[PDB]
Amino acid sequence: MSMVYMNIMMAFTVSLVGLLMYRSHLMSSLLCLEGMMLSLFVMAALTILNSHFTLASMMPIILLVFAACEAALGLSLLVMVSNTYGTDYVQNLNLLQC
Amino acid sequence: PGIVELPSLEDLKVQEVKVSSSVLKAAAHHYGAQCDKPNKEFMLCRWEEKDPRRCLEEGKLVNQCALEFFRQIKRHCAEPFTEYWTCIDYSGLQLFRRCRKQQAQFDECVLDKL
Amino acid sequence: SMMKWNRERRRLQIEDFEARIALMPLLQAEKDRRVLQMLRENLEEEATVMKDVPGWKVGESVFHTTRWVTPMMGELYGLRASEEVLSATYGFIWYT
Amino acid sequence: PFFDVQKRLGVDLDRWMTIQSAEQPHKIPSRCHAFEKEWIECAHGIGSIRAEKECKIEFEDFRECLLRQKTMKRLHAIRRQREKLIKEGKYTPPPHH
Amino acid sequence: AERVAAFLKNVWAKEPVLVASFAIAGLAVILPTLSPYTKYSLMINRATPYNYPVPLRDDGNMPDVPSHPQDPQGPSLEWLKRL
Amino acid sequence: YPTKETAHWKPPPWNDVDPPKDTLVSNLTLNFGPQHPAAHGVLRLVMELSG
Amino acid sequence: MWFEVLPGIAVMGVCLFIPGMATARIHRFSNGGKEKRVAHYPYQWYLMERDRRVSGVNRSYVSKGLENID
Amino acid sequence: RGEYVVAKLDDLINWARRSSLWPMTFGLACCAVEMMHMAAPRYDMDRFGVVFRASPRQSDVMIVAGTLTNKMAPALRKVYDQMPEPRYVVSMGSCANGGGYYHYSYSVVRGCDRIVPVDIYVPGCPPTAEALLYGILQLQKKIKREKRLRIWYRR
Amino acid sequence: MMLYIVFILSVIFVMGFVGFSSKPSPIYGGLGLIVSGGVGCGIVLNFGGSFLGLMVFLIYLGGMMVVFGYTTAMATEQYPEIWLSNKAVLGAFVTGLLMEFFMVYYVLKDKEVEVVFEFNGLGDWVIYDTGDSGFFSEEAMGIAALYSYGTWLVIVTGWSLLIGVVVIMEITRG
Amino acid sequence: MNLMLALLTNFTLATLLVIIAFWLPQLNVYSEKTSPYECGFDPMGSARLPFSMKFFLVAITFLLFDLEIALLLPLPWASQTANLNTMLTMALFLIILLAVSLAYEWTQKGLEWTE
Amino acid sequence: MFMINILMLIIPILLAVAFLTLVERKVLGYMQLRKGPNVVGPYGLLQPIADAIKLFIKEPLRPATSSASMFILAPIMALGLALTMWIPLPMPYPLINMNLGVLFMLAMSSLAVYSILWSGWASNSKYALIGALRAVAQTISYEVTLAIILLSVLLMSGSFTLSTLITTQEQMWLILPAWPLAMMWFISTLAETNRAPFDLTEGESELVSGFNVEYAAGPFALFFMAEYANIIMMNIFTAILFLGTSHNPHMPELYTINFTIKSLLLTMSFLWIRASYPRFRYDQLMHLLWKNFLPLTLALCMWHVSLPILTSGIPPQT
């Protein structure tokens, strides 16, 4: 494939590894989810624009709409985690081991 | 998978209509009226064949009719036409609406002399 | 007032669009020759550059079909100075 | 679709955007329109098992149009040979290049 | 009507901004169906030629298709000039 | 099956509700004055703020 | 008095006039005395590219009229 | 001639600095009321380029307008240290000058010059708004006489 | 060099991703995401998507501003971590940069590269379309068709956004 | 190329002014001068301590509403369609649902800041 | 020649910004029964020059607790993006003619907010942080209404190109058919530029100096220039949107003179407003936009989608 696809596919993989390798802040990982959506938007937009798939031009817009619903949902849960524990640390969410 | 058959450079040779877009736009409405037949025959060819190499001869007749069309303007209405496409050329958008006076002079010239 | 003005702007757009429709055959005829001529020149220089290459067959398609296929930018401007390649690829996007 | 209510009800919910050779606004064609049309018509009705072998030529052409992988492989070779010859001094480009 | 009319005069006193909003949104929803000029919007949009008009092969039996653009046959925009 | 790794596990609450942490969402403490346009230059208004 | 605020307004007005005046004049200078060609859509850029080829001097603002048709 | 060039550059930086003195919005007691009257229309300090700014980072002058107590002294020194340089201090009124009516009190600093260096002392209890303005214009003339670049040239 | 503009932007695109994927303080992660949003907008613009490019930049700028507010409230510590302050963060940062540097160095050396999957490296311009002169923006025509072709898309997205408001209210009402 | 040049010049000009600002003046750096500002008294606690957001729900609602404008911005182009019956209905449907969503959050006290 | 065109854009901008500072001080002064600057140069004409020189030979401070890189970056962003906002403005010809010029200006305005957030956060001080979070609240308040207000106006113009607004208003100012939107646009620009009665991110009487409280000297000047540059630019945007000037292609300077007068008067109204009103509370600003403008803006966005269609007056796409 063309060389741009190398860097966009690399960007998605970097964000995916970022998502799968948590640190402490839950917000750091929610950022990696938004990054994953950014790389999909760019990769989808390039393919659609290059091929002149006219009707598909709206598809990246729809992707962003549900990226925001995902982001808003992630922040709402972060608020409730923050209220319960005083931090958004993910190691506090271990009650359900038992 | 096979070699692509390209016409030789000496089959692509036609006399070119070397005028600027402002010149083409000024004459476009009369050009579309006068050169309809060869022009609509080339476009029916291109859409039917879906191949530029299958329509070269038709495309050459488009060029010839265009040169003949501009020769007629040159012989009769050269000066009213130059004023008109000079006015169109000034506009960054090449707007018809800014040059209705020069267009009127050109239109009545070609209406009388042709 | 805006209704009347926007109606006149729609009548002016139609006239502008129709002048383009008048000229499209001439522009289409020219574009065909320029593309075919540019492809011929690429094939002349492919012949010499790849003359010594063992398996090369100059001008060979990558498609099984013999139908005409519109060339991509790399094929049309494959062996041309970057300045004209830059103009043909990014000229329109970068114009103001 | 798992349940084909679209076919039964005769309502087009999403199959208008499934292929690039379907009707587009103002009849703008996709770059690979003809290749997609050729592959789609070859494979129509015969099923994927047959289409995977009996329409391989059409699919390969369509795939080449989509990603142009073989075209860049060819242009890469010509560009590599040219840069080799130039430095060796064997080749001079024509005035129009 | 009294209950609704009394409700109207109440929201004018308390929330005139929301009264205007609902009034404006209502006219947006309703007037396009009552307008006599709505039909021309589609006609104008349809008459704008973004695409080349590819000619038809004269098979010898399409009497309602013009041979020349200045021939009588075909759609006309006289309605648009008088608009 | 008890194991050394699960020795510290306790059955969950009967009604699924764990007690609330006594964690302190501490308030921000701000020196509002003395050198402040609204403190009249000599008021050290020590304020505890939540937002 | 209030009219003593005008000198600063006049200086401010002159400065805000220059960018528009300069851009308009620089455009005419760089396009042979005409407005800079506006290319919002591919069609307009195609015509401008053809003008550059047709000019003979690689300038899309050098127009060729009937004098160039034989 | 370097002497001539540095002399003219001194005039420019001096002129720019005295023409744009931004006092810190900082006042302590009754003297601060007369400072308000200097900003009021009759005297319009702003017409001299003198503009109050609340942040010490954006101030050139500290006008100590009122009594400095022992409890307030560390805060006054703090906000003076936080002024970037060059910075100037105008002592306004008897209290700031040397303690004034409260000189013998257990809780009062006997003059703000025990805490910060002072460029101008404005006498009065309070100095009139005009007296304070006279002090500001006296500060301007002190800045006009500065020889920073001429002394650097001869170092 | 300008012919490789899309490739250069895509390199910065990845660098921004390494920025926030190494997960420093979310203040700096947000900055990394904003840079990638801008260059990502630059990349999509160079393929003819002016509206898509600007829209994704506009959306992520609003998003990261809300993330900034939530960071100062719910994801802060006394010593927020830059990339150099934490060994795990620094190691991820350098690892990502080195992998990117190597893929770039080799793909620009051979005009091609094989990093798992074969990528051509002739410049992204070779694949572009050659023949267009329409009086409209094709991307604009496709996007506008949302309201005439995409009735079904409008309904499901419209409903999802309304339910989203309902849902966040429920989730955050303890 | 013109756009890139214009951006480079703007930020180059701003960067140069900052370089002059830091290398032209005479500095006198010491501890008390650069300490954080809190009206003359030392701060109590770090400024990095959590700062509660009382409009947190409006902020999340902003993300959803901010995306609606991305759906609505193409409306001038959609008005150029021949299929105006569908486009107008769908255009009004989207705005109405946004208005309903605002009304819900309003009536359910979602726009009021936490106390 | 284009590089010269750029310099003939930003140097005048900086000069106009410098003398706007004088004009505001004089205009405010006379509304307050005083004079404002009238000593430093005749009628105070040199006052801006003294202030600029003063600030740039003043010692800049990097606070001990501050994040060094972000602290320096933010003022560069503020001024660099303030200048960027001017390049697509048709006066009557833009320096950069854009297809989506309005969308470019929205995006560049959103990016500029981060020069407030990062300066405030990088300072690492309480008044700076409070100021920054007020900017978060301010952007949430006006951004959605601002975009939808523009949309409604652009449904009469037909495109996102700023030069098309000149064509749209050839016969009549858009303020006539859209004065309700012009009113709500005008208030939004006051909130967008952090101007009174929405000067909350600074909020002097409350936060000393808010987000820029730790900034001194040259770095402080950059924030000041950026703000006053945005005040003029936002009022040029308003003049183009609603008070469109007629453009004679052969006498483009007549457009510039007329358009400059309108831009100046609109800028004066900003100074006028600052002299007249008290300040909003920053929660009350959010409720103003969301509970008043947004309901009205949604309704008027519906009306301006339908009005072209029902009157058969849809603008041309091109």
Ligand SMILES: CCCCCCCCCCCCCCCCCC(=O)OC[C@H](COP(=O)([O-])OCC[N+](C)(C)C)OC(=O)CCCCCCCCCCCCCCCCC
């Ligand atoms: C909107 C843009 C506006 C920008 C305006 C820019 C300012 C224009 C006016 C310039 C006037 C000349 C500057 C003089 C101010 C110097 C500060 C000062 O007063 O220090 C006193 C000092 C006095 O030092 P000193 O040796 O006497 O003693 C100080 C040390 N202690 C405290 C121990 C006593 O002057 C100097 O040290 C040098 C004076 C040099 C004068 C020539 C200036 C050259 C500047 C180049 C510096 C090199 C770094 C590059 C910076 C960027 C270059 C542009």
Ligand SMILES: CCCCCCCCCCCCO[C@@H]1O[C@H](CO)[C@@H](O[C@H]2O[C@H](CO)[C@@H](O)[C@H](O)[C@H]2O)[C@H](O)[C@H]1O
């Ligand atoms: C011009 C014709 C179109 C007009 C459409 C007007 C619709 C207005 C919708 C309500 C907007 C007002 O917002 C709020 O509404 C509630 C009811 O919901 C009103 O309160 C009302 O509640 C109930 C009815 O529901 C009544 O018993 C009560 O007496 C009345 O005050 C408030 O006065 C007002 O604060």
Ligand SMILES: CCCCCCCCCCCCO[C@@H]1O[C@H](CO)[C@@H](O[C@H]2O[C@H](CO)[C@@H](O)[C@H](O)[C@H]2O)[C@H](O)[C@H]1O
């Ligand atoms: C802050 C971190 C920033 C990271 C940015 C990362 C950038 C990635 C590297 C991009 C460099 C690409 O480098 C690009 O390669 C091609 C190779 O043909 C060169 O293109 C070349 O074309 C022909 C080849 O015969 C030569 O005559 C010409 O001299 C040369 O320009 C470009 O001149 C060069 O600019």
Ligand SMILES: CCCCCCCCCCCCO[C@@H]1O[C@H](CO)[C@@H](O[C@H]2O[C@H](CO)[C@@H](O)[C@H](O)[C@H]2O)[C@H](O)[C@H]1O
């Ligand atoms: C919570 C869910 C809320 C759902 C709200 C849905 C609101 C829908 C309100 C009706 C809006 C459309 O109303 C309808 O508009 C179309 C134009 O677009 C009009 O259509 C008319 O003009 C068009 C051209 O513009 C012609 O093609 C058509 O033949 C003609 O009938 C209809 O006469 C009118 O009835």
Ligand SMILES: CCCCCCCCCCCCO[C@@H]1O[C@H](CO)[C@@H](O[C@H]2O[C@H](CO)[C@@H](O)[C@H](O)[C@H]2O)[C@H](O)[C@H]1O
């Ligand atoms: C399609 C676009 C045009 C339509 C407009 C769409 C937005 C409609 C918003 C409707 C809001 C109705 O519901 C709203 O709920 C609250 C209850 O908390 C009511 O009442 C409350 O709010 C108002 C104002 O904040 C207060 O004066 C009142 O004291 C309080 O009780 C509002 O008066 C009412 O307006």
Ligand code: SF4
């Ligand atoms: S000097 Fe006089 S007026 Fe000033 S603070 Fe002291 S007692 Fe009050």
